[PDB]
Design a protein around this ligand. Sequence first.
Ligand SMILES: Cc1cc2nc3c(=O)[nH]c(=O)nc-3n(C[C@H](O)[C@H](O)[C@H](O)COP(=O)(O)OP(=O)(O)OC[C@H]3O[C@@H](n4cnc5c(N)ncnc54)[C@H](O)[C@@H]3O)c2cc1C
Length: 453
Amino acid sequence: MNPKRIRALKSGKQGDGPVVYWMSRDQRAEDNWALLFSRAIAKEANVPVVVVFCLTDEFLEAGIRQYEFMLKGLQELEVSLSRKKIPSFFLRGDPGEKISRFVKDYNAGTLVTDFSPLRIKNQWIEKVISGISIPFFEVDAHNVVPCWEASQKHEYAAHTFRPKLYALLPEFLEEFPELEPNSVTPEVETLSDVLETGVKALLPERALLKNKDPLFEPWHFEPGEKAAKKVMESFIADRLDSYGALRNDPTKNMLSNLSPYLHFGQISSQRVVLEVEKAESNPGSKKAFLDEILIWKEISDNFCYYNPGYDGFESFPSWAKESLNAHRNDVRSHIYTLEEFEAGKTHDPLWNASQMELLSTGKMHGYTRMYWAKKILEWSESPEKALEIAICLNDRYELDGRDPNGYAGIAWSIGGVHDRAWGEREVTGKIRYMSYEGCKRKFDVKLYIEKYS
Ligand SMILES: Cc1cc2nc3c(=O)[nH]c(=O)nc-3n(C[C@H](O)[C@H](O)[C@H](O)COP(=O)(O)OP(=O)(O)OC[C@H]3O[C@@H](n4cnc5c(N)ncnc54)[C@H](O)[C@@H]3O)c2cc1C
């Protein structure tokens, strides 16, 4: 167990009670460094380990598609943890008040949580730190190489972060030890009732079409830790050989479809890398898939961790801020409102088809995700308005939304973060441009539009 994966958030006197794992980002029992580190400290203190999850008040800012996907995986996780004699407690409310009350009520000895560079997680950490007196640690269980160890600053390009991450792969790319169960079972509400009351509160804002029928189709991705492993096994056996050649074709289902599991932490990215590395397939396809799940995935955490305003215009590179400022007063071809973007009522059938795939499946194709956001910048009144519209529609309808990948992905498309300067155009400036005619020369756009009417 590498001590470089764990950081100390607050020092204090350790109590004589159970070690608490404040689970948040990595919702899984297997291949979880944060849960394994909590079990090791629990063994050294001759005390059991407990898992605590907080059902926050911000769930109403999303939809039923994310609430059901997360809770149905937590129901399976509670059974998995119970088989390891590890009790799980699901609190409802503010993490600042619930975690502080749980630590005092249960005589917690040490508090451990997983790492997340998002602003809302740092908001919870500041509140919990102010209300506890026991040691507080955090463990990077989402990245193969810890986010604070891969780079000590913001990396402006993938060609500068790739050699840093690959040089540390021989040290941090390792097999996971088995989660040892608690020696004996130690001393809030049923998740089925929390799911029923939560869905009832989200029903008035459910995405529907004109026939009052729901738009979301929940049979595309089954939630859970067991279903995540089956999707990974199917990708290595059926789709990994053709990933390098068909990853940019939205008409082909050649992607791994692992992002909804990778977002909620239902499967470990280090586990996927370990199985892909030992798989015999196309070397160009393995290099392309490892460049997405390792470089681009962990450089998104590096972008959110070293840029406080990762969701703002100030985080864009200087060349892009100067270019977008010089074209602020350019007359846009079209100006669509948030409701017109949300309903897919633009003049572009390819953009509307990309929005319908987002509304119906909760997972838009990776290639169309770039064209979907770059047209928001082209058809908005300002780059700041384009950021708000792109972040709103991403976090609301994408099953993998509210993720550092989404913010770093939106920043790449609109602000050119981790990109270079291209030919200077009007409105968009030197930001990389994606045209409708360019997509037609890359894939069958007519089949993608007809699939999502
Ligand atoms: C406008 C826009 C919005 C996006 N929204 C999200 C989002 O809300 N949540 C999210 O997790 N990703 C987002 N992405 C990144 C990317 O599109 C998705 O990660 C990818 O499509 C997820 O589907 P997949 O797992 O089948 O892709 P795969 O090709 O099978 O890759 C597997 C994993 O590699 C990682 N990965 C792949 N592509 C990227 C990428 N471009 N950036 C970062 N990591 C990547 C992901 O972790 C992904 O799960 C967004 C990109 C853009 C341009």
